[model samples]
Target: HSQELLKDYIKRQIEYYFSVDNLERDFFLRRKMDADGFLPITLIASFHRVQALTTDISLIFAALKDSKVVEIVDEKVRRREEPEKWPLPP
Candidate 1:
């Protein structure tokens, strides 16, 4: 089922990237860039294309909404509102 595939994709991302430490590191880097206003438009567009094949479009978003990656991104977005200056992505 497509739902199972989404779960498997997340697991595969964790495994393929190796330990959770590494997973977090990679995710953090990507999200940091995102926070700096560099959206992964191409990557997301590709993902959207793939997601269109699935029955539930929200499945992937729902699954990863509470993930560490999303948490980090959310935190960064929140921090951007403060007076403290943050470095832009390189």
Candidate 2:
């Protein structure tokens, strides 16, 4: 249940933070631009829930393979669509 559980955890968490419906409510999170002005990555590994589960960053990487809202950028991650295109479906 290590990788499998961790993967689900990662996907769901990132999805919410980036989902079109919730994105504006948490709108500020999408603008975490780097000091150098590059797009930022949310290092979810430091999230206590994730850390308690595991610190294997690779599993974190593998997890987002299933994400529609997140993208893996090596050790960290960013939203798939900075503003998620807004073509939401039920």
Candidate 3:
């Protein structure tokens, strides 16, 4: 039961991140939201492109917001407790 609960919770988190309001949803869906579960490396780098578009005020703001989201996901992963099933036999 606990395993099922954890899986459901993670699924909900993934769904929320891929929602339309999120700027990275399209790229995320295309990438299959892999095991590590963060934005694709290319998309993460693209966030920096906003700094180049000086005229687009909205793009700058959106970039800053999305960059934070990426950082938050990384932080969560870093803080995740080691799974109980670690070190499975090869």
Candidate 4:
């Protein structure tokens, strides 16, 4: 039961991040460029958050390695599609 619960929670969190609003926000921030047309703090913070989550999730998966539920969650994340491209500009 506990394994199932943990898997469900992780799966939902992954789904939430892939949703329309979250994906769009991420894409917009990622494409923003500064006056010199270089990436800025926006990209930095976004990458930081992504790295933090990757670290945390990898640790959790490491701890749960023997569980079937963990395998399912891992597979789902692995097979998920990339975020939709920036919608072809307006």
lDDT of 4 by residue, 3-73 (tens): 46554454444444445566557545334522222233222323543444444544344433433321223
**Candidate 1 residue-wise lDDT, 1-88, digit = tens:** 7466665565334233323354345554344444343333224324433345443424434444434433224322212232122323
lDDT (Cα, tens digit) per residue for candidate 2, span 1-84: 646876797667756655667755643454453432123333556766667767776676677778776666554555655433
- lDDT of each model, Cα atoms only? 0.38, 0.57, 0.34, 0.39
Residue ranges of candidate 4 with Cα displaced over 4 Å: 28-90
Best by TM-score: 2
The local lDDT score (0 to 100) that residue 19 gets in candidate 2 is 64
Q: Supply the global lDDT for candidate 3.
A: 0.34
Poorly placed runs, candidate 2 (over 4 Å): 34-42, 82-90
Which predicted model would earn the best lDDT?
2
Ranking by TM-score: 2, 4, 1, 3
TM-score of 1: 0.32
Please count the clashing residue pairs in each candidate, in the order shown: 0, 0, 0, 0
